[PDB]
Design an enzyme around this catalytic site. Structure first.
Site, short mmCIF file in Angstrom:
data_model
loop_
_atom_site.label_atom_id
_atom_site.label_comp_id
_atom_site.label_asym_id
_atom_site.label_seq_id
_atom_site.Cartn_x
_atom_site.Cartn_y
_atom_site.Cartn_z
N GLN A 63 -22.01 3.20 -30.90
CA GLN A 63 -22.17 4.31 -29.88
C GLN A 63 -20.26 4.27 -29.20
O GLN A 63 -19.88 5.52 -29.05
CB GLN A 63 -22.76 2.88 -28.92
CG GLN A 63 -22.97 4.08 -27.63
CD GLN A 63 -23.72 3.29 -26.95
OE1 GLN A 63 -24.61 2.66 -26.90
NE2 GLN A 63 -24.27 3.80 -25.91
N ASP A 64 -20.05 3.88 -28.78
CA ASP A 64 -18.63 3.29 -27.73
C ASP A 64 -17.71 2.91 -28.48
O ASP A 64 -17.66 2.01 -29.00
CB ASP A 64 -19.34 3.44 -26.62
CG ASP A 64 -17.96 3.67 -25.40
OD1 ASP A 64 -17.91 5.24 -25.05
OD2 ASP A 64 -17.46 2.75 -24.06
N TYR A 66 -13.96 0.12 -29.19
CA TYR A 66 -13.19 -0.76 -27.92
C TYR A 66 -12.41 -0.30 -26.76
O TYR A 66 -12.25 0.68 -27.66
CB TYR A 66 -13.00 -2.02 -29.48
CG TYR A 66 -13.49 -2.63 -30.51
CD1 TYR A 66 -14.87 -4.02 -29.61
CD2 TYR A 66 -14.13 -2.45 -31.27
CE1 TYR A 66 -15.11 -4.35 -31.19
CE2 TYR A 66 -14.30 -3.06 -32.37
CZ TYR A 66 -15.05 -4.22 -32.01
OH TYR A 66 -16.31 -5.22 -32.81
N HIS A 67 -13.02 -1.14 -25.74
CA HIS A 67 -11.71 -0.46 -24.70
C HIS A 67 -10.63 -1.76 -24.57
O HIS A 67 -10.96 -1.16 -23.52
CB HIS A 67 -12.38 -0.36 -24.09
CG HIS A 67 -13.25 -1.27 -23.20
ND1 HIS A 67 -15.02 -1.35 -23.22
CD2 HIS A 67 -13.19 -2.57 -22.66
CE1 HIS A 67 -15.66 -2.21 -23.40
NE2 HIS A 67 -14.59 -3.16 -22.54
N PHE A 77 -16.72 -0.61 -34.99
CA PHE A 77 -16.72 -2.38 -35.09
C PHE A 77 -14.97 -2.17 -35.70
O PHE A 77 -15.08 -3.86 -35.86
CB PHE A 77 -18.05 -2.87 -35.81
CG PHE A 77 -19.09 -2.87 -35.26
CD1 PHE A 77 -20.06 -0.60 -36.04
CD2 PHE A 77 -19.93 -3.11 -33.94
CE1 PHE A 77 -21.37 -1.22 -35.13
CE2 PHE A 77 -20.93 -2.53 -33.20
CZ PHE A 77 -22.10 -1.81 -33.92
N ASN A 123 -18.60 6.36 -34.40
CA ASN A 123 -19.15 6.22 -33.45
C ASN A 123 -19.19 7.37 -32.94
O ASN A 123 -19.41 8.67 -33.10
CB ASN A 123 -18.21 5.17 -31.97
CG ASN A 123 -17.87 3.96 -32.33
OD1 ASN A 123 -18.20 3.33 -32.02
ND2 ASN A 123 -16.34 3.22 -32.15
N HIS A 187 -29.21 -4.20 -32.04
CA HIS A 187 -27.95 -4.38 -32.46
C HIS A 187 -26.97 -5.67 -32.45
O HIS A 187 -27.19 -6.53 -32.24
CB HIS A 187 -27.31 -3.96 -31.70
CG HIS A 187 -26.11 -2.70 -30.93
ND1 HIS A 187 -25.34 -4.01 -30.66
CD2 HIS A 187 -25.56 -2.13 -30.88
CE1 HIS A 187 -23.80 -3.47 -30.58
NE2 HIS A 187 -24.12 -2.33 -30.97
N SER A 189 -24.71 -7.34 -30.99
CA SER A 189 -23.82 -7.74 -29.76
C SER A 189 -24.45 -8.81 -29.45
O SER A 189 -25.95 -9.09 -30.09
CB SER A 189 -23.84 -6.38 -28.56
OG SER A 189 -25.48 -7.29 -27.85
N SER A 192 -27.95 -9.04 -28.05
CA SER A 192 -29.03 -8.25 -28.92
C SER A 192 -29.36 -9.02 -30.47
O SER A 192 -30.83 -8.70 -30.62
CB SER A 192 -28.93 -6.93 -28.59
OG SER A 192 -27.76 -6.75 -29.01
N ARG A 195 -32.56 -10.72 -31.54
CA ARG A 195 -33.67 -9.47 -31.15
C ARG A 195 -34.06 -8.58 -33.09
O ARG A 195 -34.62 -8.25 -32.32
CB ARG A 195 -33.60 -9.15 -30.28
CG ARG A 195 -33.53 -10.31 -28.89
CD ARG A 195 -33.46 -9.55 -28.16
NE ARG A 195 -32.92 -7.75 -27.23
CZ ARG A 195 -31.81 -7.94 -26.24
NH1 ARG A 195 -31.95 -8.90 -26.04
NH2 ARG A 195 -31.55 -7.15 -26.57
O1 302 Z 1 -29.29 0.25 -28.01
C1 302 Z 1 -29.14 -0.72 -27.99
O2 302 Z 1 -30.16 -1.61 -28.83
C2 302 Z 1 -27.52 -1.96 -28.14
C3 302 Z 1 -27.79 -2.58 -27.34
C4 302 Z 1 -26.29 -3.10 -27.26
C5 302 Z 1 -25.19 -2.96 -27.01
C6 302 Z 1 -24.46 -3.45 -26.90
N1 302 Z 1 -23.13 -3.49 -26.83
O3 302 Z 1 -22.28 -4.70 -26.41
C7 302 Z 1 -20.81 -4.24 -26.63
C8 302 Z 1 -20.39 -4.98 -28.40
O4 302 Z 1 -19.49 -5.39 -29.41
N2 302 Z 1 -19.49 -3.33 -29.14
C9 302 Z 1 -18.81 -2.98 -29.81
C10 302 Z 1 -18.66 -1.76 -30.40
C11 302 Z 1 -17.43 -1.55 -31.17
C12 302 Z 1 -17.99 0.48 -31.68
O5 302 Z 1 -16.76 0.66 -32.35
N3 302 Z 1 -18.71 1.17 -31.76
C13 302 Z 1 -19.74 0.12 -30.71
O6 302 Z 1 -21.27 0.68 -31.27
N4 302 Z 1 -19.73 -0.75 -30.33
C14 302 Z 1 -25.13 -1.40 -27.20
C15 302 Z 1 -27.14 -0.96 -28.24
#
Ligand code: 302
Length: 223
Positions: A63-64, A66-67, A77, A123, A187, A189, A192, A195
């Site tokens: 998704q995003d 790291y910030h 990741f 990402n 995910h 994280s 989650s 789960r």
């Molecule tokens: O849709 C869902 O089910 C869901 C559930 C929980 C999350 C959570 N994110 O929390 C932050 C954890 O760290 N992520 C790092 C991280 C680094 C990176 O390069 N890319 C990335 O996608 N993530 C996201 C989506």
């Protein structure tokens, strides 16, 4: 070094003249004038630098970026040396250890060794303002990375897509299941991971699927 890997540029540059892409470039450039934006410019496209687009075997959608300082470097990741693996990455490594007995933790968080083997670590959103998660959401990156996923769906064959969490599952929703392998779970994280991610065994499953595709397996410990 190069800003954007040549084999990827050849196939994705049709995006570059589209109105959304021009707008995206302007947005990111303006953001960099006023904020620290991660990754730095030379690392936004690291995912295009590690292997030829023709040699992609596995796709992990994020998704995003790291910030935090020094973390994002253009592979989902992953964190470069000497940065400690963040909790999500520690969880990925924990699942690897239970899934594949012979996995060896590399003692760092740099996933470049997977990227070089054709694991695309993509990402959906490729930049982020420092300390502000999702600050560049829906500014144009999604359309671009959708174009990447679409290209691979159409022009490669027998890929393994690993879709971790609901967001990744949505992004991979149109992958042709007759032409590619798709594995899904929660995910990694901390909020989650229990789960479904722990116990998903995606890494061993991926290598079995790669056999069906006629391809050599990923050595997940080659990091
Ligand atoms: O849709 C869902 O089910 C869901 C559930 C929980 C999350 C959570 N994110 O929390 C932050 C954890 O760290 N992520 C790092 C991280 C680094 C990176 O390069 N890319 C990335 O996608 N993530 C996201 C989506």
């Amino acid at each position: 070094m190069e800003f954007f890997g040549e084999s990827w540029k050849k196939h994705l540059s049709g995006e570059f003249g589209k109105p959304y892409f021009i707008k995206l470039m302007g947005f990111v450039a303006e953001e960099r004038k006023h904020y620290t934006v991660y990754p730095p410019p030379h690392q936004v496209f690291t995912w295009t630098q590690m292997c030829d687009i023709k040699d992609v075997k596995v796709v992990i959608l994020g998704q995003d970026p790291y910030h935090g300082p020094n973390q994002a470097h253009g592979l989902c990741f992953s964190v470069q040396r000497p940065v400690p693996p963040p909790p999500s990455l520690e969880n990925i490594y924990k699942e690897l250890s239970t899934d594949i007995e012979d996995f060896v933790h590399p003692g760092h968080g740099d996933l470049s060794g997977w990227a070089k083997q054709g694991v695309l670590l993509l990402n959906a959103v490729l930049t982020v303002r420092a300390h502000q998660a999702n600050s560049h959401k829906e500014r144009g990156w999604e359309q671009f990375t959708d174009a990447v996923v679409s290209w691979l769906n159409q022009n490669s064959n027998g890929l393994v897509f690993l879709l971790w969490g609901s967001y990744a599952q949505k992004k991979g929703s149109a992958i042709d299941r007759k032409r590619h392998h798709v594995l899904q779970t929660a995910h990694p994280s901390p909020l989650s991971v229990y789960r479904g991610f722990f116990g998903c065994r995606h890494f061993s499953k991926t290598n079995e699927l790669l056999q069906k595709s006629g391809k050599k397996p990923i050595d997940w410990k080659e990091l």
